[PDB]
Design a binder for this molecule. Sequence first.
Ligand SMILES: Cc1cc2nc3c(=O)[nH]c(=O)nc-3n(C[C@@H](O)[C@H](O)[C@H](O)COP(=O)(O)OP(=O)(O)OC[C@@H]3O[C@@H](n4cnc5c(N)ncnc54)[C@H](O)[C@H]3O)c2cc1C
Ligand SMILES: Cc1cc2nc3c(=O)[nH]c(=O)nc-3n(C[C@@H](O)[C@H](O)[C@H](O)COP(=O)(O)OP(=O)(O)OC[C@@H]3O[C@@H](n4cnc5c(N)ncnc54)[C@H](O)[C@H]3O)c2cc1C
Ligand code: PRO
Ligand code: PRO
Lengths: 478, 481
Amino acid sequence: MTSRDGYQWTPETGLTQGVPSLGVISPPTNIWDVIVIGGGYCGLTATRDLTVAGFKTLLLEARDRIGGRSWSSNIDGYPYEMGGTWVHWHQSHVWREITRYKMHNALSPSFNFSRGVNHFQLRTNPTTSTYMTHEAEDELLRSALHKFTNVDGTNGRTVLPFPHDMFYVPEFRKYDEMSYSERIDQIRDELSLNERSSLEAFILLCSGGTLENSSFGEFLHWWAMSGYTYQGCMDCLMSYKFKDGQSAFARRFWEEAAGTGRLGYVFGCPVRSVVNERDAARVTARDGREFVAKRVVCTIPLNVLSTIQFSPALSTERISAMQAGHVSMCTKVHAEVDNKDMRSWTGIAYPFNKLCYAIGDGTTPAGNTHLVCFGNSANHIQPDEDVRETLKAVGQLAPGTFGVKRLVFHNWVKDEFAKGAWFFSRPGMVSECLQGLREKHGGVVFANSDWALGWRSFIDGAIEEGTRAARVVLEELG
Amino acid sequence: MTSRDGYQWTPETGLTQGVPSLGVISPPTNIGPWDVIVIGGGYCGLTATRDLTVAGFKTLLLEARDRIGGRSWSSNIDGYPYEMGGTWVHWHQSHVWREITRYKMHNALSPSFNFSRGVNHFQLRTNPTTSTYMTHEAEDELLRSALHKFTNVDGTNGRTVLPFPHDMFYVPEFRKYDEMSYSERIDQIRDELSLNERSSLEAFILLCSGGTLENSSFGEFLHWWAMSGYTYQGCMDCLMSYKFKDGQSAFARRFWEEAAGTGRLGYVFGCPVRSVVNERDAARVTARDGREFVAKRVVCTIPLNVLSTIQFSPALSTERISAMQAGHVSMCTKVHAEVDNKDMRSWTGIAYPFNKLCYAIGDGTTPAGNTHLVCFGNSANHIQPDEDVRETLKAVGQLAPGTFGVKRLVFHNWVKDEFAKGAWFFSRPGMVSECLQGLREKHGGVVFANSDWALGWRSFIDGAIEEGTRAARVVLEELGT
Ligand SMILES: Cc1cc2nc3c(=O)[nH]c(=O)nc-3n(C[C@@H](O)[C@H](O)[C@H](O)COP(=O)(O)OP(=O)(O)OC[C@@H]3O[C@@H](n4cnc5c(N)ncnc54)[C@H](O)[C@H]3O)c2cc1C
Ligand SMILES: Cc1cc2nc3c(=O)[nH]c(=O)nc-3n(C[C@@H](O)[C@H](O)[C@H](O)COP(=O)(O)OP(=O)(O)OC[C@@H]3O[C@@H](n4cnc5c(N)ncnc54)[C@H](O)[C@H]3O)c2cc1C
Ligand code: PRO
Ligand code: PRO
């Protein structure tokens, strides 16, 4: 089943739009106690919980598929992860689901240093490269991240001992209010070019933004969640993916909800408005269709919420967050390349390149190396706009070492139903707005990974929030 | 209300049996037909029961004790929760943290360690006559050093041989470590360890196993180590850092209240089971006093070390029988002491191998303003805390001789407890590789679920919840609707 989402390029086809996905639901409709808006992990979790608990639930989704900001496309026997990819057993909510759905043994490691070039390629200007062992890479990143995170003498353990409760130590607020650039400026004289370049590339990989617009405290939050170490981060952020792709995982939620007999759904159904009435809420599609339920779980992403009409009017904090928007404009490009030895390659090309961080991520059945490449707002490319330029950015990660057989990507920035990649905050945004983003709104429960407490911005945060939403609805409806 | 479980001692009152707990359920019964019977109201049974009742199943919970919680429960004594068994939790523990967050208790934790005032040192005792004192930074360094040597069997402290701890056979080299004892591993590195390194190492690993150096699986420790992030700090974070402000019984109550609130929960406490028999369309569960209960499926959460007391029909597999015969090795003695030294809030100690309590920390301050110490003993130098109060007081005092007097002791003897026969699961060499599949296996209409044979945080509160979640899933799949 082909989605409208996604792009693929090959020499023989050029650039084409729309790729297959297990996430595509057919037929698109099968038609209420609850309406759930959005079929990403947050909506899937809420819907699964609610239907299992006995509630008649209508899921309305703008796209032709489930998964939202995370979905996979199987092409020539290999799953390409268009958005959210990596998971770990230190991520409570996603791991709980993985184990309950018995997919704990269905993971693959992204890193494999068993053969090939077995090096990290650091490029700090367009004309040269520095190569080092993965051990040296580890040491370099450890050194730079130590200096970056050591605001309190314990790399964040003192100012942020309980990352689920950011104000537990009052002084954390000042780090939430700090930009990446402001922190770098404090340690600048203590960083070599190699340290600073790898550091900036890594922290911008995480934020998808710029040094000026990314919150230092939010990175400290990721760091803390991961165990306050570089290896903790690598383990949680980039180590383990589904063998069969994320869309296989999303299906499990879908199949369970569907099996209850209490699931109604409409795909290709973008909501334009949500109005609170007496004892119920009314949801209206762009095309005028109306749906009514006792409660609504709205999972529309933060960067998309300004397109919706709510009455009653949303709070001041909700509006300010929505209008400012989060900063992650990550470009994620998959390249299937003809260099077999690059399975064990990693690269940082910064700041001159429109893709700044990349890894060997797998081998396709055709025996080609799969590279996953990441770009941010500091030097941004829209991968769809000019494939020649996209290929150039890919190539410049390791000039003269490979030819590209395939590109696969989804443009999250230009996606009207995402308007950005995963949540990453501006300085001060989380401390100022998190409470407002999580607050009650009559018959509407606002739930999205964007404003979770723990693994905020992760698949895990989506599930945390969907679980909360279902709990709220169940308690309110008795 | 007062449980039959637990002990307390004060100079004024002497030793008394039975302590209060929010885990005590009154009235002890509210009673079919029954869709499911869940045997045991520990975290495994509570999770299964909550999931099942919420999913619409008429569920009967049968519990031997007068309380919920099983191997984890708290007693509030003069406003302080004493953790009788399972205590510590962390957000790197998937199943317990999921429950904590969903019940909105993520902000209801307290840190055990507080080094902001007081003696602020680690006291290492390797013989009865002297002590070595060091900073907690030096303590960290000592343990990091010793645990590095202990765990580095593969050059990466376990990451190569056990990359996926939920799948122990992923790498073939792991089985030989599961089959290795603590003593066999130490023998491979003995010449590389100072007395201080080996003493603190052996204390720490025996803290974890509750067993002996000879009967404790090295691979099982490597499993804990891996689950925790393959570092000493990961271990400390996951094993001993954060507890519930209001005690574990407050957490257990949340599961109870949700299950009860469905209107689909039947229950009987003080109802020990003697047999479970698979019949044609149902299973029959019979109590010690002869009462019979019938349901379509049974979730049996009776612990491994207690299973041999139960009569099953049909007979169990060789693997399940052999595990329940051999038994797990954790005979941990856990003793709380409310003490008169205020400065010991920031104290930690290891006294090894000469003391019957080996590992201890300052864990809190009671409302009365007294330091709370928690003390742990293993099977290499074991004490039954209820046998002789004076011997128990002696063991406590020898952790820091001449520094404090004891105002109160609080403990439960897990070893002699007929419904536990041991503390948390910890395996003999080769036991998990040989028996884990057997222990997890279907048995007609009976689902065997317990932390003792979980895949991830096996032996933890987390593992109990993992297993309870699996059990409800199996039942819902097999029964439908
Ligand atoms: C490129 C990229 C890489 C990532 N990498 C990782 C990773 O490695 N690991 C990880 O854990 N996470 C990763 N993330 C994070 C990510 O996957 C998300 O945070 C998570 O999936 C969000 O789930 P959600 O349900 O909360 O939101 P979404 O998934 O965005 O779901 C909500 C969505 O609501 C719908 N919607 C929007 N507007 C309307 C409307 N008007 N009407 C109806 N429906 C509407 C969307 O179409 C529907 O699917 C990544 C994300 C991206 C984009
Ligand atoms: C001293 C100690 C310290 C611990 N420390 C920690 C810790 O810090 N953190 C952590 O996560 N875990 C810790 N643990 C682990 C521990 O809490 C358990 O692994 C977990 O609680 C077990 O849950 P369970 O449900 O699987 O088993 P249990 O809790 O044992 O529950 C099963 C039980 O079934 C019942 N039963 C037994 N026989 C019968 C019968 N014949 N008929 C009816 N019912 C019967 C028991 O009474 C009932 O409660 C500790 C355990 C102990 C003892
Ligand atoms: O997949 C992505 O794009 C983000 C960035 C690195 C980890 N996850
Ligand atoms: O409470 C206990 O006894 C176990 C041993 C140390 C960590 N938790």
